[PDB]
Every structure is written in C-alpha cells, then in structure tokens.
Amino acid sequence: VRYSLDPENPTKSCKSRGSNLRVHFKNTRETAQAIKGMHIRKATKYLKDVTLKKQCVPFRRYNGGVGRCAQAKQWGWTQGRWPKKSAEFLLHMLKNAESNAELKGLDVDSLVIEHIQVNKAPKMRRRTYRAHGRINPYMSSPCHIEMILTEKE
Amino acid sequence: SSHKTFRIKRFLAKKQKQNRPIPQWIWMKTGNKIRYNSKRRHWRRTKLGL
Amino acid sequence: SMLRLQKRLASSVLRCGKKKVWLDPNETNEIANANSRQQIRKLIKDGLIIRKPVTVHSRARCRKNTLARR
Amino acid sequence: NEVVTREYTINIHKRIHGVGFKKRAPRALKEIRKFAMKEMGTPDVRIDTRLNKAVWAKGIRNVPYRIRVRLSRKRNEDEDSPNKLYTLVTYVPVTTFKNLQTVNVDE
RNA sequence: UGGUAGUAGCAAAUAUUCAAACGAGAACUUUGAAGGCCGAAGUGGAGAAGGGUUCCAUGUGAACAGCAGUUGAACAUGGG
Numbered sequence: 280v281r282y283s284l285d286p287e288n289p290t291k292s293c294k295s296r297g298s299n300l301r302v303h304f305k306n307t308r309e310t311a312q313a314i315k316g317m318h319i320r321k322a323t324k325y326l327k328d329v330t331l332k333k334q335c336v337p338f339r340r341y342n343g344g345v346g347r348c349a350q351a352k353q354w355g356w357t358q359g360r361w362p363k364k365s366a367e368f369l370l371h372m373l374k375n376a377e378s379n380a381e382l383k384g385l386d387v388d389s390l391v392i393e394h395i396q397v398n399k400a401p402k403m404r405r406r407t408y409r410a411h412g413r414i415n416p417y418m419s420s421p422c423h424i425e426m427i428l429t430e431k432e
Numbered sequence: 433s434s435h436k437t438f439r440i441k442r443f444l445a446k447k448q449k450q451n452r453p454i455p456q457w458i459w460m461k462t463g464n465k466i467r468y469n470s471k472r473r474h475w476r477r478t479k480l481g482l
Numbered sequence: 483s484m485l486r487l488q489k490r491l492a493s494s495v496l497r498c499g500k501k502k503v504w505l506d507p508n509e510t511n512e513i514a515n516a517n518s519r520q521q522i523r524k525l526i527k528d529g530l531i532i533r534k535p536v537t538v539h540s541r542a543r544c545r546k547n548t549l550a551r552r
Numbered sequence: 553n554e555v556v557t558r559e560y561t562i563n564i565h566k567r568i569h570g571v572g573f574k575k576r577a578p579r580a581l582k583e584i585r586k587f588a589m590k591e592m593g594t595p596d597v598r599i600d601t602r603l604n605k606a607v608w609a610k611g612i613r614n615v616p617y618r619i620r621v622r623l624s625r626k627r628n629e630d631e632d633s634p635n636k637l638y639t640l641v642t643y644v645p646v647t648t649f650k651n652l653q654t655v656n657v658d659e
Numbered sequence: 660u661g662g663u664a665g666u667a668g669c670a671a672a673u674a675u676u677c678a679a680a681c682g683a684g685a686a687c688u689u690u691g692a693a694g695g696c697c698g699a700a701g702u703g704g705a706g707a708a709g710g711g712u713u714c715c716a717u718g719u720g721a722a723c724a725g726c727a728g729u730u731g732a733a734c735a736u737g738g739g
C-alpha cells in the first residue's frame with residue numbers, strides 16, 4: 280500500500296506492514312529504534328537476547344518511571360527494559376519481511392533495516408471500577424508497525 | 433424462580449427466541465444496512481426488567 | 483485432552499465424589515472418548531476407572547488414650 | 553562420553569538458608585534444578601516424581617538438609633528441542649550423608 | 660486528543676511442587692503423585708425469593724473474563 284517513505288531503490292527492497300497489533304506503543308517504538316540500523320541476522324539475535332533478558336532495549340523518549348539496568352551502559356543510556364511480546368511481534372514482522380525478500384528473489388544475508396516506523400492505532404476501550412461508584416476508561420494502546428529492508432554491502 | 437407463572441414463562445419464551453442472532457444470508461440483500469443485531473440481550477448486563 | 487465430563491460421570495456412577503475417582507494417566511485417549519454413563523461402566527469393569535480407597539483415620543490412638551482414662 | 557550418570561549430595565539447608573517458610577520447598581526444587589544445570593551443561597533438566605515426593609516429604613517449610621541425587625545426562629528423544637541432550641534427577645534413599653564422596657556410577 | 664504515564668496500582672481470608680497428555684504455543688486446561696486449606700454454625704450436599712436458558716455436548720479463540728489462557732457463566736450451533 281502507501282507507506283511513509285518509499286525505498287530509494289525499490290528493485291532490491293522488501294517491505295512489511297502490521298496494522299492493529301495489540302502491543303504497547305511506547306514499548307514498540309523504543310524497541311524499534313534500537314533495531315533501526317541493524318543487520319537482519321544481527322537484529323534477530325538481538326531480539327532473542329531481549330526475549331531471554333540478555334540484551335536490553337534502552338528507553339530514551341518514553342523514559343519516565345522505568346528503572347535502570349546494568350545492560351543499558353552499552354547503549355550509552357541509563358534506563359532500559361526487555362519487552363518480550365513487543366520484541367516477538369516485530370520479530371515475526373522481520374521473519375515476514377525475510378519471506379518477502381525470498382519471494383522477490385534477493386540475498387537474505389545482505390539485508391540491513393533502513394526504515395522502521397511505529398504509529399498509534401485506534402484505541403479500544405474497556406471498563407474499570409473505582410471508588411464511590413465511579414467508572415473510568417481502560418483504553419488499550421495498539422500500534423501500527425511499518426518496516427522496509429534494503430540490500431547493502 | 434422455579435415456580436414460574438404461565439404468562440411470565442411465555443414472556444421469557446418470546447425474549448429467548450428474540451435473542452438469537454441474525455442469519456448470515458440476510459446481509460446479502462440490496463437495500464440492507466443491518467451489519468449486526470444491535471438489540472441482543474445478555475443475562476449479566478441487561479436484566480430484562482420484570 | 484479434557485476429562486472433566488468423564489470424571490463427573492465416574493463420580494456419579496461410583497456414588498462417591500470426584501476426589502476419590504482415579505482416571506488412568508496412560509489410557510487418556512481411551513478414557514476421553516467415553517462421554518456416556520453406559521460405557522464408563524465398561525471402563526470400570528476394564529479397570530481404567532478405579533475409586534481410590536478411603537483415607538485412613540484410625541482411632542487406635544483414641545482407644546489407647548481412653549484405656550488410661552478408664 | 554556425553555551419556556553419563558553420576559550421583560552427588562545436595563546441601564539444601566545451605567542453598568535455601570534465609571528464605572521464607574512458604575518458599576523453602578519450591579526454591580529447594582529450583583536450586584536442585586539450578587545445581588543440575590550448573591554442574592551439567594544442559595538447561596533441560598527433568599526432576600523425577602519420586603525426588604519431588606522426597607523433597608516434599610516433610611512440608612513446604614521443612615525439607616531435608618542433605619539429599620542424595622543421581623544425575624544422568626541422556627541423549628534426547630524425538631520432538632527435537634534445541635537442547636540435543638537432557639538431564640534427569642533421581643532421588644537416592646540413603647541412611648546417612650557422612651563421608652559420602654561424589655562417586656561416579658557406571659552402567 | 661495530550662502532559663501526568665508506560666505512572667499509581669493489579670498486597671483482605673497460610674500454598675503450592677513435580678511428570679505426562681492435547682496443543683503451534685502452558686506458572687494458569689486435563690490426568691497422576693505429593694504438600695495444603697474449608698474442618699459437618701464449612702470453601703460440602705439440597706431448597707424459598709430473585710435471575711431466565713446462565714443447565715448439557717461439539718466447534719471457534721474475532722471481542723470480554725483489568726496477565727494469559729488449549730478454560731469459561733464469552734461467541735455459534737443443537738438438545739434439555
């Protein structure tokens with residue numbers, strides 16, 4: 280469909296899209312920024328390390344509240360976490376992008392992620408119960424994820 | 433209540449038969465705007481009155 | 483798979499609660515496709531459904547104490 | 553070389569000293585599994601039910617201080633997990649845990 | 660629709676552990692074993708008022724059950 284920015288060389292580029300994904304936007308954006316400029320294989324093992332709590336995702340923008348971790352120093356940051364389901368979702372997206380590259384007929388081992396973007400999806404409401412007979416929303420924060428990979432040397 | 437009267441039981445019977453979903457062949461009509469049955473009743477949200 | 487139906491049926495036939503009903507952990511596939519009180523009786527006769535013996539509550543200690551009381 | 557069987561003794565009292573009463577036995581199982589994974593390079597560790605009964609013989613807040621465990625690294629069966637081999641822990645009923653070396657048993 | 664903010668919190672009633680099965684996926688389903696609680700004024704078995712298909716079986720896991728769910732008093736089919 281219509282993406283944010285088209286690849287400069289569409290001949291050797293693959294794309295992936297995910298809409299209305301039940302995963303936190305704030306976690307997804309910051310775990311996407313860490314893997315923004317990574318190689319395809321390096322990103323996948325990074326996500327597995329995040330799932331196994333071996334490498335952390337530095338929280339830079341949505342930094343309020345989240346505590347520190349010893350692994351954050353390698354990123355030059357003081358705060359980080361390990362959102363496993365956020366890592367898993369775009370890990371599946373990376374696999375889907377790799378399949379698209381295989382379908383197009385490109386070299387998988389030369390794919391470097393160039394553009395990855397996370398946007399806010401329409402929130403779906405739920406109900407929570409408070410004191411004095413009050414009702415407040417329990418809104419979710421789903422996100423849209425868009426990714427484009429291009430071959431590099 | 434297990435000691436239901438005839439009229440109340442008949443009223444509950446009609447409400448139960450009204451609670452069924454819309455068949456899937458209707459929304460293929462030309463002049464149709466019924467995407468779903470909006471007047472469905474659940475025993476835990478709406479108590480039907482009485 | 484799912485065995486709540488079989489356990490409830492076995493308890494009803496055995497005239498005891500589901501606490502003492504022992505379902506064979508090996509022939510789960512054989513048990514799972516019973517779904518009828520008539521053929522769980524066949525399973526009972528086969529031995530796949532056994533009621534566990536009542537938990538022991540001995541009064542031997544009580545009787546020994548009452549002997550000293552007397 | 554890799555399919556081996558060896559038995560040790562585990563000082564549960566040392567490994568759970570200071571944990572809460574409602575957490576002693578579950579942590580004792582975790583420490584037994586952690587010890588097996590630490591001494592044998594295999595994250596896949598399975599604890600026998602008889603060993604589970606032996607650990608929980610007294611109660612959640614009361615466990616034997618020392619327990620004899622036969623630890624065996626075995627070649628994995630079908631349904632190929634990433635771990636090419638697994639480890640099995642078996643309880644060894646022993647009267648006294650005195651002058652007991654970590655002997656290596658043989659087939 | 661934002662900052663608050665991925666924050667407050669998800670802390671009333673002692674407590675879960677192990678192996679297997681289905682399953683693509685299991686701290687949460689099922690089985691078996693162990694350890695527990697309610698302790699016959701019960702966390703048991705049955706009624707009246709009240710609710711009205713919530714009862715039973717199969718399938719789904721789109722939405723809900725403030726985590727997740729192979730589970731449901733959820734949804735769809737048929738009975739009673």
Ligand SMILES: [Mg+2]
Nearest residue numbers: 340341342343
């Ligand atoms: Mg800030």
Ligand SMILES: [Mg+2]
Nearest residue numbers: 343344345666
């Ligand atoms: Mg603050």
Ligand SMILES: [Mg+2]
Nearest residue numbers: 407408409410
């Ligand atoms: Mg509240």
Ligand SMILES: [Mg+2]
Nearest residue numbers: 410411412413
């Ligand atoms: Mg109120």
Ligand SMILES: [Mg+2]
Nearest residue numbers: 344666667668
């Ligand atoms: Mg908090």
Ligand SMILES: [Mg+2]
Nearest residue numbers: 669670671672
């Ligand atoms: Mg509470």
Ligand SMILES: [Mg+2]
Nearest residue numbers: 703704705706
């Ligand atoms: Mg009852």
Ligand SMILES: [Mg+2]
Nearest residue numbers: 714715731732
């Ligand atoms: Mg039911």
Ligand SMILES: [Mg+2]
Nearest residue numbers: 724725726727
């Ligand atoms: Mg939930």
